[PDB]
Amino acid sequence: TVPKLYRSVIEDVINDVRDIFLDDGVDEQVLMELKTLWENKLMGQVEEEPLNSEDDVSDEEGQELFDTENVVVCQYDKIHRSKNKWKFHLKDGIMNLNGRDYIFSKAIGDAEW
Amino acid sequence: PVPPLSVRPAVVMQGSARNQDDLTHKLADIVKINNQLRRNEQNGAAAHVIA
Amino acid sequence: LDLAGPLLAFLFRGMFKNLLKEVRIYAQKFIDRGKDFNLELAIKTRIISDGLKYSLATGNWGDQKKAHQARAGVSQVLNRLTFASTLSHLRRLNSPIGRDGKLAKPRQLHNTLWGMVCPAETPEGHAVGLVKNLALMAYISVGSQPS
Amino acid sequence: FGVLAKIVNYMKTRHQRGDTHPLTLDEILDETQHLDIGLKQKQWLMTEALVNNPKIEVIDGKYAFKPKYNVR
Amino acid sequence: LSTMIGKGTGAASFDEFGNSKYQNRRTMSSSDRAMMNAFKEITTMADRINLPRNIVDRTNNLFKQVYEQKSLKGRANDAIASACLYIACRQEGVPRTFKEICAVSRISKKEIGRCFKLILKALETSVDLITTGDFMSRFCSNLCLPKQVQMAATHIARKAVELDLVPGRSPISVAAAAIYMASQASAEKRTQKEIGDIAGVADVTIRQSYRLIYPRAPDLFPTDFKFDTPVDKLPQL
Amino acid sequence: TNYKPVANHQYNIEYERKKKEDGKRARADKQHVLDMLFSAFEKHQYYNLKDLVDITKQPVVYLKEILKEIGVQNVKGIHKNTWELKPE
Amino acid sequence: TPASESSGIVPQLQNIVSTVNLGCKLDLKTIALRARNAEYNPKRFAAVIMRIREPRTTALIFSSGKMVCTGAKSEEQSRLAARKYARVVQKLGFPAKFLDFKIQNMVGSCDVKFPIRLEGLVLTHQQFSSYEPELFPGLIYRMIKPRIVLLIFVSGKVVLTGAKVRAEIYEAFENIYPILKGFRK
Amino acid sequence: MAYQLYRNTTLGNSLQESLDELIQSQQITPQLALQVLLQFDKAINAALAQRVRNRVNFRGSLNTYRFCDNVWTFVLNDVEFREVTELIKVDKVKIVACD
Amino acid sequence: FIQMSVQRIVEDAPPIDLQAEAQHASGEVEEPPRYLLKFEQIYLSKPTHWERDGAPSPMMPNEARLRNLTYSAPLYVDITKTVIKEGEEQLQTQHQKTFIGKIPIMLRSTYCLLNGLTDRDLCELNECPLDPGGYFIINGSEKVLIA
C-alpha cells in the first residue's frame, strides 16, 4: 500500500519534471536513467565566579550529533505542556523505524521529561 | 467695558452658582477667544487664522 | 386633520431613521478597531424610548434644536375640571395660524362646517374661531391603501 | 534605485569615516554586497547612475565622493 | 466655557465662494470630552438592563471621583465605567452579577472584576457581601414563577445556607439550584436549560449543586407550602 | 436578551486570531528589513507610513529612525505624509 | 507564642523567585540553536526558556544579560539552580558571570486541618479582606506588616505570597492563625 | 512555500544523489536539479494532502527538545507508536516539526 | 398607528450594507468583509414596568399616575444579519428578536390592558368605568394630543 504511494509519487514527480527536462533539451533517456537509478537506490572569587562549583552537570552529546536512532519528519499543529508533562498535536508525517517507513496525517501525543 | 455684577445677578434658582447670567456666558466666550487671539499673537501668529 | 396616528408617525419615522444612523456608525467603529461586534449593543434604545417620551410631554415637536416654530403646543395636559371638559377636550381640533394681530376669514364660521364642527363652541378669548370643536356625530377617516 | 541608495549610504559612511579615496565599481558592488545585481542594472549604473549623476566625482579613473559637492 | 451658534437666516453670511455659511462651530472641553463620553456610555449600559436613574446617578458620581484622583488613568475607560456601574448597583442593595454587567458591555468579565478591585483600592472603600436573597427575586420573576414558589425558594435558599450544606459553592449557583428544586416541586417545572439561560451559569453546575442539596430536601421546604409532587416523588437528574 | 457572553463572542474570536503568533516584530533583522525597504522603494518613489508598517511588520518609531537615516519626508494636505529615499 | 505553638506547623515552601545578571550580552537564537532541552519563540516572547530536573527548576534568560530563575524548593537550592544555569552558559563559552543574584519572592503554603466561616472574617476585617465568591473561590488578605498576600479557603487551606524572607511568612501566619481559630466552625 | 525539510529524508536523499550522478555525468545543471527538488516538494506535499489520510498515536519518554525559527526539534527515548491495527516500538527517535 | 404605521415604516426602505476598507496598500486574495442588515416583523408587548430589582411586572394606569411613571409598552423588532461575503461564505444567516425602545401607549386603546376587562373588573382596578380614555400618561401627567 505504501510502496504504491511512493510509486504514485514517482509518477507525479517524473511527469511534472519531464517538461523541465524538455525545456532544457535534456534527453528522455536521462529521465528514465534517473528513475531507474533512483528506484535502485530506493530499495573575590565567590562574588564573581563560584560557577565552577557545578562542573559536570552535563549530559550526552551522543543523542543529537550521531543520530544513531531513527528519525521522523512531520509538522506540528499545537504543542502544550504542564510542568514536566508535555502534550503534542502533530499533523502530516513520514516515519522511519528500525527500517520501515510509515506515514500519518495526524498524530497526538504525550511525553514526560 | 464689562457691566457690573448687579446687571447680571445670574438668578441662582436653587443649586448654587447655577446661574451664570447667559450674558456672562457670552462674555466668557469673548474673553476666551480674545485670550486665544492674544496667545496667537504671542505664539505662531498665522494670517487667515488671525483674520 | 392630522390625528394621534399621523402626528406620532412623523416622529417615529424620524427617530427610527436617526436610530438607523447611530447603528451605522457603531458597525463602522467595530470594523475599524480590529473587529468586535454585538448587534444587540449597537441599538441605542434611548433614541426612540426617550425621544417619543420627550416630544409628547413638553408639547414641542421633532428636532427641538430648530423645528418648533409653528407646530408648538400640540400636546397638552388633559384638562379634568368636570366630565364635560374632558370629553370636550379630547374632541377638540386646532387650526394653526399666525399669532398676535391677524384679521381675515379663517376665523368666521364657513358653511361647510355644517354637521362637521360645532356652531357655537369656541374660546371666548384671543384665539376665537381658530381652536374648534368637532360636532357630536362627526367622524374621521383612518385611511388605507388605494390598491 | 534602492541598490543605488545603498551605494550612496556606503559612500556616505566612507566620507564620514574621513576618506574620499575612489574605488572601482566592482569593489563598490562587492563592499555593498550587490555583486550579483546583474549586467543590466550595472549597465544602468554605468549609463545613468554614474554618468548622469549631477554630483559624482570622477578621479583616478574611478568614481568617488557622491554625498557632497556644495562645500569642500 | 461658551455658548454655541448655528446656521439659518437664509444667508449672506459669507462662504463668499465656497459652500460654508459664516463659520464652523468650535469644541470647548476636550480634556474632559471623554468624561462626557463616559457618561453617555453609562446611561446606554444602564438602560439596556432597565436600571433606575438613582443608580445612574451613583454610577456617574463614583466615576467622577475615580477620574479626579487619576489613580487608574491607564486602564480602559469603558472598563472603569462598567466597574462603577457594578459598584453602584451593589451599594444600593440590589446587586447585578458580573455576568449581567458584562452582557450589556463590550468589556470582559475578567477585566471588569479586576477594575472592580482596583477601584475599591483607589477609593479606600468596601461593600456588603452578596446573599442568596438579593438574586432569588429577579430570577424567579423572569421565569414567570408563582409568588408562593418564589417564597419557598427563598426559604430553601436561606435554610440551605443556614445548614451549611454548601461550603464549597457560590451563592448564585445555590440560588439556581433552589429555584430548580422549587420549580420541580411545583406544576411549572422550568427546565435546567431555561434556568441556566436566565442565571447564566452552566447547567452542569446546577446539576451538581442539586445533587448536593437533594439528601436534605424534606427539611428545606416551608411547612405551609402547597405541594404538587411530594419529595418521595421528586425526580433525580 | 443578553444570554451572557462573560467573554464577548466576537471578542473571543479576535483574541483567537491574536492567539496565533502576534505582538512580536522584527527590528532586529535590520539589514533584511532594509532589503524590504529597498525592494519597496523600487516599486514607487514615495509611500505612506501606513503602507510601510503593513509591509515590514516592525515598530513604527524604529522605522522612523531608519527613514531619518536614509530618507526625508514630504507632507501634503491634511497631515498626509509620504517618505522617500531622495532619488537622484 | 509558646502558648499556641501548635500554630508552629511550619508552612511549606513551594516556589522561589529570584533573578540574576550574567554580566554579558548574548544571542538567544544561537543559544536556542546550540542548547539542549530549551525553547525559544521570538515571535511569541523575547526570553529563551530552559529547564532542568535537578532541583526541578526553570530559568528564562534575556539578551541584555539579565535572567530570572524560578521553580526552587528553597533559596539555597535556588542559588544552586541559578549557578547551574550560569555554569551551562559558561559551558557555551560565553562570558558567564555570577553577578547580582537576588531573591524576589518566596511562596509558602499549609493546612490548618479545620473548617472556618469566611463570612465572619470578611465582616470583622472589612478594611483589608476582599472576598468575591462569585469570581474567585478563595479570600484575599492583604497584611501591611510583612506585606504579604494570603489565600484562605473553607477547607482551611492557606497560601502566602509576596514574601521576601521566610521569617515574614511565619510571622504573618503566627499572627493570623488565632483569628482563624476564632472563626472555626 | 513547501518546506525543504523532506529533502533530508532517505527518499529525498536518494533523489539528491540521483541528481548528483546526473551532474557527475554533466547531463543536467545544478539549478535544474534544484527546480526538480522544488517540484518534488510540491508533488509530495500534494500526495500528502490528497492521498495520505491515516493517523498514528504515540507515548514515550522525552529526552531533549528545541524550538527556533518556528521549527520544533525533538529527540524522544523509549517511544511507542500505537495504531489501530499495528504497533511500533523503538528505543529512540528524533522529531522535527514545522508549521 | 401601531397595527399599521410602525410596521410599514420598519419595512419601508431601510436596508443597510457596509463593506470594510481592507486590503489597503496590499490586497489580492478574496475578501473585503461585507455585512447587510434587514428588519422584519415588529412586536409590541403589554405595558410593562421594570422594578429596581430588575423584575418586570404589569403596570396599572392608576399606579402609573401615583408613582409618576410613563405608561408605555416595550417594542421589539426582528433583525437579521446576512453575510454574503465576497466569495467563500454566503449562507451565514441568523435570526434575532430584539428590544428597540418604549412606545407610549394611549389609554384604553387596543394595546392598553384596560380594553379587555369588564365593568366589574375595571371597577376592581380602581379605574372609572365611564372614563373615556384616548389620552397618553406621561411622567404622572395625563396628556392629550390636539387634532
UniProtKB/Swiss-Prot annotation, chain F:
Q: Which domain of life is it from?
A: Eukaryota
Coiled-coil residues:
none
Compartments in which it is found: Nucleus
Annotated residues that bind DNA are located at: 77, 79
Where are the disulfide bridges? none
Subunit structure, as described in the record: Heterodimer of an alpha and a beta subunit. Interacts with HTATSF1 and GPBP1. Interacts with URI1. Interacts with GTF2B (via N-terminus); this interaction is inhibited in presence of GTF2F1.
Question: Which family does the entry's similarity section mention?
Answer: Belongs to the TFIIF beta subunit family.
What does this protein's UniProt record list under function? TFIIF is a general transcription initiation factor that binds to RNA polymerase II and helps to recruit it to the initiation complex in collaboration with TFIIB.
- Protein name as annotated: General transcription factor IIF subunit 2
Q: Which organism is it from?
A: Homo sapiens (Human)
What gene is it encoded by? GTF2F2
From Swiss-Prot, chain G:
Associated disorder? Spinocerebellar ataxia 17: Spinocerebellar ataxia is a clinically and genetically heterogeneous group of cerebellar disorders. Patients show progressive incoordination of gait and often poor coordination of hands, speech and eye movements, due to degeneration of the cerebellum with variable involvement of the brainstem and spinal cord. SCA17 is an autosomal dominant cerebellar ataxia (ADCA) characterized by widespread cerebral and cerebellar atrophy, dementia and extrapyramidal signs. The molecular defect in SCA17 is the expansion of a CAG repeat in the coding region of TBP.
The protein's GO terms of the molecular function aspect are: aryl hydrocarbon receptor binding; core promoter sequence-specific DNA binding; DNA-binding transcription factor binding; enzyme binding; RNA polymerase I core promoter sequence-specific DNA binding; RNA polymerase II cis-regulatory region sequence-specific DNA binding; RNA polymerase II core promoter sequence-specific DNA binding; RNA polymerase II general transcription initiation factor activity
What stretch of the parent protein is included here?
Answer: 153 to 337 of 339
Q: What is its main location?
A: nucleus
Q: What is this protein called?
A: TATA-box-binding protein
Tissues and organs where the protein is expressed, per its UniProt entry: Widely expressed, with levels highest in the testis and ovary.
Q: Which organism is it from?
A: Homo sapiens
Q: Where does DNA bind?
A: 15, 51, 66, 105, 142
- Subcellular localization(s) per the UniProt record: Nucleus
Q: Which residues form a coiled coil?
A: none
sequence repeat coordinates: 13-89, 103-180
UniProtKB/Swiss-Prot annotation, chain H:
Q: Which molecular-function annotation in GO is an example for this chain?
A: RNA polymerase II-specific DNA-binding transcription factor binding
The answer to whether keyword Nucleus applies is yes
Q: Do you know which CDD domains this protein is assigned to?
A: TFIIA_gamma_C, TFIIA_gamma_N
GO process terms (BP): positive regulation of transcription by RNA polymerase II; positive regulation of transcription initiation by RNA polymerase II; RNA polymerase II preinitiation complex assembly; transcription by RNA polymerase II; transcription initiation at RNA polymerase II promoter
Cellular location of this protein? Nucleus
Transport keyword on record: no
Query: One of this protein's Pfam families, by short name?
Result: TFIIA_gamma_C
A GO cellular-component term linked to this record: nucleoplasm
Query: Chief location of this protein?
Result: nucleus
Which keywords does this Swiss-Prot/TrEMBL entry list?
Host-virus interaction, Nucleus, Transcription, Transcription regulation
Q: Which domain of life is it from?
A: Eukaryota
Q: Where is the signal peptide?
A: none
Role description: TFIIA is a component of the transcription machinery of RNA polymerase II and plays an important role in transcriptional activation. TFIIA in a complex with TBP mediates transcriptional activity.
The entry's family comment says:
Belongs to the TFIIA subunit 2 family.
What does the record note on quaternary structure? TFIIA is a heterodimer of the large unprocessed subunit 1 and a small subunit gamma. It was originally believed to be a heterotrimer of an alpha (p35), a beta (p19) and a gamma subunit (p12). Interacts with NCOA6 general coactivator. TFIIA forms a complex with TBP. Interacts with HSF1 (via transactivation domain). (Microbial infection) Interacts with SV40 Large T antigen.
Protein's name in the database: Transcription initiation factor IIA subunit 2
The organism named in the record is: Homo sapiens
Swiss-Prot record, chain I:
Superkingdom to which the source organism belongs: Eukaryota
Instruction: From the Swiss-Prot or TrEMBL record, state where the protein is found.
Output: Nucleus
Family, as annotated? Belongs to the RNA polymerase beta chain family.
Q: How does it assemble?
A: Component of the RNA polymerase II (Pol II) core complex consisting of 12 subunits: a ten-subunit catalytic core composed of POLR2A/RPB1, POLR2B/RPB2, POLR2C/RPB3, POLR2I/RPB9, POLR2J/RPB11, POLR2E/RPABC1, POLR2F/RPABC2, POLR2H/RPABC3, POLR2K/RPABC4 and POLR2L/RPABC5 and a mobile stalk composed of two subunits POLR2D/RPB4 and POLR2G/RPB7, protruding from the core and functioning primarily in transcription initiation. Part of Pol II(G) complex, in which Pol II core associates with an additional subunit POLR2M; unlike conventional Pol II, Pol II(G) functions as a transcriptional repressor.
Q: What is this protein called?
A: DNA-directed RNA polymerase II subunit RPB2
Record the organism: Homo sapiens (Human)
